[PDB]
Design a protein around this motif. Structure first.
Motif, PDB file in Angstrom:
ATOM      1  N   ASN A 184       0.831  -1.232   0.000  1.00 43.81           N
ATOM      2  CA  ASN A 184       0.000   0.000   0.000  1.00 43.81           C
ATOM      3  C   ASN A 184       0.857   1.271   0.000  1.00 43.81           C
ATOM      4  N   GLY A 263      -6.288   2.347   2.678  1.00 48.95           N
ATOM      5  CA  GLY A 263      -5.635   2.394   1.370  1.00 48.95           C
ATOM      6  C   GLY A 263      -4.889   3.707   1.190  1.00 48.95           C
ATOM      7  N   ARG A 264      -4.199   3.880   0.080  1.00 47.25           N
ATOM      8  CA  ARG A 264      -3.561   5.188  -0.264  1.00 47.25           C
ATOM      9  C   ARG A 264      -4.620   6.288  -0.261  1.00 47.25           C
ATOM     10  N   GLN A 268     -10.479   3.583  -2.988  1.00 47.48           N
ATOM     11  CA  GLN A 268     -10.410   2.101  -2.929  1.00 47.48           C
ATOM     12  C   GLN A 268      -9.763   1.666  -1.614  1.00 47.48           C
ATOM     13  N   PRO A 269     -10.182   0.506  -1.068  1.00 42.08           N
ATOM     14  CA  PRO A 269      -9.569  -0.068   0.118  1.00 42.08           C
ATOM     15  C   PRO A 269      -8.120  -0.476  -0.199  1.00 42.08           C
ATOM     16  N   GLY A 270      -7.292  -0.542   0.829  1.00 41.69           N
ATOM     17  CA  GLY A 270      -5.931  -1.088   0.749  1.00 41.69           C
ATOM     18  C   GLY A 270      -5.952  -2.502   0.233  1.00 41.69           C
ATOM     19  N   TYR A 271      -4.859  -2.945  -0.396  1.00 45.08           N
ATOM     20  CA  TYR A 271      -4.687  -4.376  -0.765  1.00 45.08           C
ATOM     21  C   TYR A 271      -4.315  -5.171   0.498  1.00 45.08           C
TER      22      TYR A 271
END
Ligand SMILES: Nc1nc2c(ncn2[C@@H]2O[C@H](COP(=O)(O)O[C@H]3[C@@H](O)[C@H](n4ccc(=O)[nH]c4=O)O[C@@H]3CO)[C@H]3CC(O)(O)C[C@H]32)c(=O)[nH]1
Ligand SMILES: [Cl-]
Length: 395
Positions: A184, A263-264, A268-271
């Motif tokens: 991330n 996430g960044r 979108q959510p973090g990986y």
């Protein structure tokens, strides 16, 4: 009579027994595997699976290596993608589709991961994603929203650690926790085909963790699982496998939350890191043992088997059909944490599938993370030593 005692009686009576070597040492994953096996064995007339605990996942790969050296393998075993790469160097593994096991409907995040040179060599079985575990009561007490971004996550850890007089972000100093920060921050382990452990994103990730320890907001956990350390000092957050879900729920004296990863950006959510294992079928098994493996694998992929296994544990159901099963639907309707685990499974990254990866992640990368976090080594200097040791091992 315990499920493992019933399985022993089932296998004693059976005319064909296919051994399944696994790395479940106990808790909900071990009980859920054994329940799946009792049900399968009951529908079979004299054809059974015998699960054999081999210790943890590292004990399991050691045990399989000994079996290659002894010349006697099980019918099936659990395997990470890097363990599959290693077993394929010995041509040890049967292609799954050659048994006629239908894979249509398996999540492409998981099916891509077991495909080597265009051929599927494992069945995704117990696949986990990292999630954000949190203390709902402690965030509510101090007015702190669940963090959506890495920036908010650090801000929240600092505010709460100051208010509670102790570090509230708990973490294991290991390759799995490092992978969440690394991915991330834009990290990639492979650059033009080469493994790189000491890239600027790796140094950035290990520095973030070491600065969190120094600044009093990040607490290293050195003895047991994070969920086994709860109750000693204030806890707000951890990043941990979804397969720990039942252990968290049982240990926490506070209202446990589960969120998607920071996430960044809020776009979108973090990986999250994918962990857990695939089932493989060894070529050396008899035709009769392979037929039992075929039926067990179609059973494991059935919507009901996936629904029950996943809701018992926190693993991610591996098939589209599992989400359409009424027993899954009933659990998800009463507990939103299951849908949270599925949504996080859409934002999913894997570590390298190199045959040597298990040794690198523990003995080289994990040691460098422990040097920086536990012994105050400079992050770049610790990761430069890891790069040197990995380069030497891969040549
Ligand atoms: N050998 C080998 N291991 C690997 C590889 N990549 C990742 N891992 C390990 O996968 C574990 C995650 O796999 P998962 O199935 O998601 O979860 C495990 C357990 O974590 C989890 N558990 C059990 C008890 C508990 O109190 N809390 C809890 O969360 O339940 C499951 C059964 O043990 C991490 C843990 C690790 O060993 O420290 C290193 C990581 C690899 O390539 N090889
Ligand atoms: Cl992201």
């Amino acid at each position: 009579m315990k499920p493992e005692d019933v399985i022993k009686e089932q296998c004693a009576r059976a005319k064909v027994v296919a051994e399944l070597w696994h790395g479940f040492t106990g808790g909900a994953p071990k009980a859920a595997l054994e329940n799946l096996v009792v049900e399968f064995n009951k529908a079979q007339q004299g054809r059974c699976v015998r699960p054999v605990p081999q210790g943890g996942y590292r004990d399991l790969s050691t045990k399989i290596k000994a079996a290659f050296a002894a010349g006697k393998v099980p019918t099936m075993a659990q395997a990470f993608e890097n363990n599959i790469a290693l077993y394929l160097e010995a041509k040890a593994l049967l292609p799954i589709e050659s048994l006629g096991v239908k894979l249509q409907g398996v999540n492409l995040t998981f099916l891509n991961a077991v495909r080597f040179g265009g051929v599927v060599y494992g069945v995704p079985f117990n696949k986990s994603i990292q999630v954000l575990y949190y203390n709902k009561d402690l965030l509510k007490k101090h007015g702190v929203p669940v963090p959506a971004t890495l920036e908010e996550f650090v801000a929240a850890a600092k505010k709460l650690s100051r208010a509670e007089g102790g570090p509230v972000y708990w973490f294991q100093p290991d390759a799995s926790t490092f992978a969440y920060f690394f991915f991330n921050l834009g990290g990639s382990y492979l650059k033009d085909g080469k493994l790189v452990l000491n890239s600027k994103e790796a140094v950035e990730a290990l520095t973030l963790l070491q600065n969190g320890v120094k600044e009093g907001w990040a607490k290293p956990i050195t003895s047991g699982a994070i969920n086994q350390n709860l109750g000693s000092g204030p806890y707000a957050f951890s990043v941990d496998t979804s397969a720990g879900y039942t252990a968290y729920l049982r240990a926490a004296k506070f209202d446990l939350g589960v969120a998607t990863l920071p996430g960044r950006t809020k776009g979108q959510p973090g990986y999250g890191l994918v962990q857990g294992t695939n089932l493989v079928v060894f070529r050396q098994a008899s035709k009769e043992e392979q037929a039992v493996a075929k039926d067990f694998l179609e059973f494991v992929l059935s919507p009901r088997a996936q629904a029950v296994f996943a809701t018992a544990t926190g693993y991610v159901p591996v098939t589209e059909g599992a989400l359409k099963d009424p027993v899954y639907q009933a659990y998800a309707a009463e507990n939103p944490d299951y849908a949270t685990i599925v949504r996080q499974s859409r934002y999913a990254k894997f570590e390298p599938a190199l045959a040597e990866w298990e040794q690198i992640r523990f003995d080289i990368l994990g040691q460098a993370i422990k040097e920086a976090i536990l012994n105050k080594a400079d992050p770049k200097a610790a990761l430069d030593r890891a790069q040197k040791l990995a380069e030497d091992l891969l040549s």
